Design a protein around this ligand. Structure first.
Ligand code: CL
Ligand code: ZN
Ligand code: ZN
Lengths: 109, 108
């Protein structure tokens, strides 16, 4: 139902808003069923995999947040440093009070 | 309870969503569904809920899952704008609900 064309548009808009440099900007997105993960990234395949099973629950704004969180790890590394938090709060201002709980709950065991 | 509480939550969500029109036709089945949470057969008015994750669902999580499925009876199989708005009105926190549920199920 949720086509790869809107998904690719959301990814491209989030990369642009985050001003990801040339190599960090070379990322694909693909729909694949996952194992209790909203999203994951294959750093070698240079692909963000969004879970096919939970994709019907996701609004465009929810996808944008999930992709921004993942994309910001490409830019800043594996930790939620101050610059990570600031950039995510700039893209999502009305999420100040829930931001850290959400990003912490997006990491696997 | 457990199966009784699910039936109570289904009946309360149908009423809340104003889908009282042929509530008796709305059925729910517990079946193992791999890594899916739920599905709905619109032609048979049957909701399928994953047996594997059902023990770990809170009343609020069940309510959200069932409301999502029941909204397909009202708007059709596509998540049109009205679907999204209604679900966001009932669950202003639906983004956190889903993220905390997936995290909980992964840990479990
Ligand atoms: Cl089925
Ligand atoms: Zn749906
Ligand atoms: Zn993170």
């Amino acid at each position: 139902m949720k086509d790869r064309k809107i998904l690719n548009e959301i990814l491209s808009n989030t990369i642009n808003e985050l001003n990801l440099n040339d190599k960090k900007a070379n990322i694909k997105i693909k729909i694949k069923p996952l194992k209790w993960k909203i999203a994951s990234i294959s750093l070698t395949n240079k692909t963000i995999y969004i879970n096919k099973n939970i994709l019907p629950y996701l609004s465009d704004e929810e996808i944008r947040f999930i992709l921004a969180h993942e994309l910001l790890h490409l830019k800043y590394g594996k930790y939620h440093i101050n610059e990570f938090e600031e950039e995510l709060l700039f893209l999502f201002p009305n999420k100040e009070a829930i931001l850290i709980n959400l990003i912490n709950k997006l990491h696997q065991k």
